[PDB]
Amino acid sequence: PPIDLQAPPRYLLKFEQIYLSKPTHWERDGAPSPMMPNEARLRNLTYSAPL
């Protein structure tokens, strides 16, 4: 259910639709990387994609 607030000003904040990317991993520079499943296994990463 959308969340409504009152301080008067009222807000709606309704969610519409979801978009799921593919498994990606960022270093310090911000470079996304394609985590090989093997790479996640090796580096103890988590095979997940941002939502």
Add this chain to the structure above:
Amino acid sequence: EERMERKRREKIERRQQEVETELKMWDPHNDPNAQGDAFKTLFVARVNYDTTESKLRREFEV
């Protein structure tokens, strides 16, 4: 000493004229191969010839 400079000048002018003819005949923007927004499209070169399309996808979809 001079015939060489003459040949360099002719080959240079000949190329420059072919350049004007190519610019007049072919239009870069009006290219069927080129598609999509120009600010969105990207250019990658020095790519190995053996790079499979899927390999380029797995490397640039990240």
